[PDB]
Ligand binder design. Structure first.
Ligand SMILES: [Zn+2]
Lengths: 68, 190, 242
């Protein structure tokens, strides 16, 4: 609930996130979803942040059940 | 440097607006549909936008023009690929066309000064001689070495064929079925 | 007057300049006055005139004044009318290594310092190419850190240029030519001055490396990117509609 604008600014500079943005730019000539989600409206940005934060990071689980 | 100038010029293409509407951007977009590979430009619009190109293009026009040509080619490549991604290999340089209304200078008042600069004038037309052609991209083979090469000429429609790729001097034949040319005419005035 | 000063102030490439221009003017005047000194292309009629102008006034310096067939002819006529490392025990001069250092367009102080190093420590040598190459490479790395930082491509281009100039395909020897000279030249005060001037200190700033090595976590490893970078990058997608 305390996801602040300064944290949003600093996390926006993520280079893999830049790779994602540019890959989508090249994949779609239209640019509606990027304007929907990008910092220009921070609601979508924080929604994406939580969406990809809840992920499992499957590499660790893969190591775990590989040991299993 | 030259890249600072080329950037200050390319910004004028897409980052300029008047009457709250893009002019040159959509002009290029329409021109590419027309298959024109050229444009129109007003040099009055460039004085207020930027002064880093006027005072140096005035005195070194030949030095600065081809940079603008290449910048236009770059913009064309970007917009071409983006438009192909939007809907629906060979993109040569685009001729730059401009005009002005700053002043007019008569032939009588000319001198041997301000030579190689840019000038304005008026007159009347007489000659329509012939569509004499020049070369832009022509291929070459050496007659003994059978060594293929290539050459391209840009604006002077300075250098000659290579004198040596034993074969001796003048070892090159000129192909035509795989060459490229443009047109020009010798126009008069009085 | 323009060309006269152009050639006279080409000597570098108080009273000296004024007296030399006067001497050149009057000497050319004397040479062109009579009908005795003709068939002389002005293409080169301001060289030995300058030599004898130097000879005249107070002092004369033989080197770099004649710096050819017709040179001696005109002098007499006027004065009467009035790989690269396997090679062992190579030799060098001032201007040879000045050229090798000047192909990069580096300043003259660095070239003079290298020349001083050579003329002081060229007695126990095996191949001067190694020492001079190492010196110039470690000068380039120290002075060009800014553009290398903003463009990691330079590293390969510079190394290729200095691998092709010495006609070699293997480069580990060049790496040695760099590290050995770094080991040897590591403790001289002029090297210290160059270090403080061009702020390489192993390619990283002093104020950052102190905290990098002191044992802190506030050390700024720039995996993230600067704010101005993002500010200037935004423009690229600002115009994405086209
Ligand atoms: Zn040949």
């Amino acid at each position: 609930d305390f996801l602040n604008d300064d944290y949003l600014k600093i996390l926006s500079r993520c280079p893999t996130f830049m790779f994602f943005v540019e890959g989508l730019i090249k994949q779609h000539a239209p640019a509606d979803e990027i304007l929907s989600l990008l910092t220009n409206k921070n609601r979508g940005l924080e929604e994406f942040f939580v969406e990809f934060l809840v992920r499992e990071n499957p590499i660790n689980g893969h190591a775990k059940f590989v040991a299993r | 440097d030259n890249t600072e100038i080329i950037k200050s010029f390319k910004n004028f293409i897409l980052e300029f607006r008047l009457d709250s509407q893009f002019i040159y951007r959509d002009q290029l977009r329409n021109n590419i549909l027309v298959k024109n590979y050229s444009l129109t430009v007003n040099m009055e619009h460039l004085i207020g936008y930027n002064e880093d190109i006027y005072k140096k293009l005035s005195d070194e026009p030949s030095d600065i023009i081809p940079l603008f040509e290449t910048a236009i080619t770059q913009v064309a490549k970007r917009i071409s690929i983006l438009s192909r991604a939007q809907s629906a290999n060979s993109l040569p340089t685009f001729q730059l066309i401009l005009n002005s209304n700053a002043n007019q200078i008569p032939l009588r008042d000319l001198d041997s000064e301000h030579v190689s600069k840019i000038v304005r004038l008026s007159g009347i037309i007489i000659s329509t001689s012939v569509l004499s052609s020049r070369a832009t991209y022509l291929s070459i083979m050496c007659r003994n070495c059978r060594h293929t090469t290539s050459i391209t000429i840009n604006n002077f429609n300075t250098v000659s064929l290579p004198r040596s790729c034993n074969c001796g001097p003048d070892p090159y034949i000129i192909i035509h079925e795989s060459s490229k040319f443009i047109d020009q005419q010798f126009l008069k005035l009085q | 007057q323009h060309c006269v000063a152009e050639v006279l102030r080409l000597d570098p490439q108080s009273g000296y300049l004024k007296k030399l221009t006067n001497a050149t003017s009057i000497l050319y005047n004397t040479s062109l006055n009579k009908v005795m000194l003709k068939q002389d292309e002005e293409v080169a009629r301001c060289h030995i005139c300058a030599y004898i102008a130097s000879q005249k006034m107070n002092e004369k310096h033989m080197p770099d004044l004649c710096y050819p067939k017709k040179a001696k002819h005109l002098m007499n006529l006027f004065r009467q009318s009035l790989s690269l490392l396997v090679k062992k025990y190579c030799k060098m001069t001032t201007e040879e290594i000045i050229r090798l250092c000047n192909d990069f367009e580096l300043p003259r102080e660095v070239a003079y310092k290298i020349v001083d190093e050579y003329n002081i420590n060229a007695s126990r040598l095996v191949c001067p190419w190694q020492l001079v190459c190492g010196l110039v490479l470690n000068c380039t790395f120290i002075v060009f850190n800014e553009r290398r930082r903003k463009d990691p491509r330079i590293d390969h281009f510079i190394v290729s240029k200095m691998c092709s100039l010495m006609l070699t395909s293997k480069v580990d020897d060049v790496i040695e030519c760099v590290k050995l000279v770094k080991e040897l030249i590591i403790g001289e005060k002029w090297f210290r001055d160059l270090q403080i001037r061009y702020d390489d200190f192993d390619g990283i700033r002093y104020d950052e490396i102190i905290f990098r090595k002191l044992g802190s976590m506030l050390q700024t490893t720039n995996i993230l990117v600067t704010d101005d970078q993002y500010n200037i990058w935004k423009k690229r997608i600002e115009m994405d509609l086209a």
